[PDB]
Structures are given as structure tokens and as C-alpha cells.
Amino acid sequence: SFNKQWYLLANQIIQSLSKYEGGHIFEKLVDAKKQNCPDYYDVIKNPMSFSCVKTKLKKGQYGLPTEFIKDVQLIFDNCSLYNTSGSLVAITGKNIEAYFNNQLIVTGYNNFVTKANTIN
Ligand SMILES: Cc1cc(C(N)=O)ccc1-c1[nH]c(C)c2c1CCCCC2=O
Numbered sequence: 054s055f056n057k058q059w060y061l062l063a064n065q066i067i068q069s070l071s072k073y074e075g076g077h078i079f080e081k082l083v084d085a086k087k088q089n090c091p092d093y094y095d096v097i098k099n100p101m102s103f104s105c106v107k108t109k110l111k112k113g114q115y116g117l118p119t120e121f122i123k124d125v126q127l128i129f130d131n132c133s134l135y136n137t138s139g140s141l142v143a144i145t146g147k148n149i150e151a152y153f154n155n156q157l158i159v160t161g162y163n164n165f166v167t168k169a170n171t172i173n
């Protein structure tokens with residue numbers, strides 16, 4: 054069915070980000086002490102990780118295909134806000150963001166967004 058199909062595509066796409074070079078840094082939520090960034094949650098008010106998105110997909114918390122995109126984009130927007138441009142972490146965020154946006158086209162995922170937008 055319609056929602057089962059884009060759930061399945063979203064699961065495939067999120068797994069491909071996890072396996073992308075450097076993707077491990079987005080897999081779990083940042084540990085502010087362990088990653089030596091004690092102010093992280095003072096700057097990032099809406100934290101997000103690949104594992105959060107995987108849990109939402111597993112539990113059925115998404116109603117619309119755009120909700121998945123919004124959460125993944127939030128990962129990269131948090132990355133670019135906290136980290137200085139040209140840092141190893143910022144570079145990695147931009148790499149995976151570009152990969153992600155291409156995958157949305159290549160996989161057809163954007164077609165589910167287009168259809169769901171018409172349904173309102
Ligand atoms: C780099 C890094 C390495 C590991 C690991 N397990 O090796 C896990 C998390 C992070 C990480 N992820 C993000 C997204 C960040 C960080 C910490 C540094 C700056 C803050 C930030 O945005």
C-alpha cells in the first residue's frame with residue numbers, strides 16, 4: 054500500500070546514509086561530555102540522529118513522506134549550525150546531505166512526496 058511503500062524506501066535510504074563514509078557520526082545522538090562539546094544542547098534545541106529516524110520508521114510515527122525528509126534534513130541543519138564551516142564534521146554533513154538529496158531523486162521517493170502533497 055502507499056504508506057508501506059514509502060516507509061520501505063525511507064528505511065532503505067536511511068540505511069544508505071548510515072553506511073556512507075563518515076555516516077557513523079550521525080548515527081546516535083551526540084554525547085555532550087564524551088564528544089567534548091559541553092554546550093552542544095545549549096545550541097541544538099531539536100537534536101536528531103539516524104537512529105531516531107530509524108525508530109520513528111520502526112514504530113510508525115510518520116504520517117507523511119515529508120516528515121521523514123524533515124527529520125533527516127534537521128540532522129544536517131544541526132550539523133551546519135553547531136560546526137564551523139570546513140571542519141571535518143561540517144564537511145561530512147555537507148557530503149551526506151548532497152548524497153541524501155540525490156537519493157530522494159534516484160529512488161523515486163520524491164514522487165511519494167508529490168502525490169501526498171496533492172492529497173493534503
Ligand atoms: C564526531 C563524532 C564522532 C563520534 C564517534 N562515535 O566516533 C560520534 C559522534 C560525533 C559527532 N557527531 C556530530 C553530529 C557531532 C559530533 C561531535 C563533534 C562536534 C559536534 C557534532 O555535531
Ligand SMILES: [Cl-]
Pocket residue numbers: 078
Ligand atoms: Cl570519527
